[PDB]
Design a protein around this ligand. Structure first.
Ligand SMILES: Nc1ncnc2c1ncn2[C@@H]1O[C@H](COP(=O)(O)OP(N)(=O)O)[C@@H](O)[C@H]1O
Ligand SMILES: [Mg+2]
Length: 271
């Protein structure tokens, strides 16, 4: 069985799953809808194209090592994995509401009730990862999935563990998306778990006004290193002081003063 992209879907996958349409894509993966034949239950099939070397070998990947460990309602669950020489197949929980990048483009901005609930979901996921010493390093809207409840309410689920790792002393790899990257990453002075809180702070800021706190014009990186968070008029005039205070504590350049996920969850705006 060959997909439209040319993927040679393993026999064991096609035996138990009916592979459907592409529901999402990224730089490294193609994600499809699929249906477990025995139950008619829907799942997502994530297909990761592995990095090729000279010769017949392919480079090894880290994502499954982290995904196997993580089980939380605000994290996309891994169901099964199938490694073949050229690609890796991941059967995951299907999140029918799509991603937060498309949601933000469609809706523009959110109410404080909606944004606070979304931050509670994200900070809940981060608290759980940080309890396991796992830093995600790629928290941003395209990696957040919108779960739609039977009553119409929504919850966020964190996905894409492609850059995730274990923090056992400071990390130095410069990685991430400029809009969401913590100043200590760009500064190359050593970073840890709280780069995820900075990313969450940037997302919360975007949810309430529709644009990021550091937009640049070099100026972008200088803005991030200085960390001056502005709440410009009229866009932020009707937003509460409580929301602004929490976003400020999440976007502190001083990592020791910056909130932990626990401190975010304890803040009155998310309670
Ligand atoms: N489990 C899932 N359920 C529904 N859609 C999913 C999904 N996992 C991923 N997606 C969609 O596929 C896109 C890319 O998947 P992701 O895991 O982020 O791959 P990547 N590393 O290439 O960026 C996501 O932005 C989202 O639109
Ligand atoms: Mg992604």
């Amino acid at each position: 069985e060959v997909s439209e992209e040319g993927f040679q879907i393993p026999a064991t996958i096609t035996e138990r799953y009916k592979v459907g349409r592409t529901i999402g894509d990224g730089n490294f993966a193609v994600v499809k809808e699929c249906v477990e034949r025995s139950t008619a239950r829907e799942y997502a099939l994530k297909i990761i194209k592995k990095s090729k070397c000279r010769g017949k070998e392919h480079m090894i990947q880290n994502e499954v090592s982290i995904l196997r460990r993580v089980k939380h309602p605000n994290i996309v669950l891994l169901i099964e994995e199938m490694d073949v020489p050229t690609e890796l197949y991941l059967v995951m929980e299907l999140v029918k509401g799509g991603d937060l990048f498309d949601a933000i483009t469609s809706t523009n901005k959110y109410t404080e009730r909606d944004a606070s609930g979304m931050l509670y979901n994200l900070a809940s996921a981060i608290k759980y990862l940080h309890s396991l010493n796992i830093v995600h390093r790629d928290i941003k809207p395209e990696n957040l999935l919108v779960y739609e409840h039977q009553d119409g309410s929504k919850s966020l689920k964190l996905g894409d563990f492609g850059l995730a790792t274990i923090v056992d002393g400071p990390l130095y790899t410069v990685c991430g998306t400029p809009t969401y990257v913590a100043p200590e990453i760009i500064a190359e002075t050593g970073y840890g778990l709280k780069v995820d809180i900075w990313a969450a702070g940037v997302i919360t800021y975007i949810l309430l006004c529709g644009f990021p706190p550091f937009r640049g014009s070099e100026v972008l990186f200088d803005q991030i290193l200085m960390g001056q968070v502005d709440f410009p008029s009229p866009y932020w005039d009707n937003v509460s002081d409580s929301a602004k205070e929490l976003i400020t504590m999440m976007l502190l350049v001083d990592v020791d003063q910056r909130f932990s996920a626990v401190q975010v969850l304890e803040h009155p705006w998310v309670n």
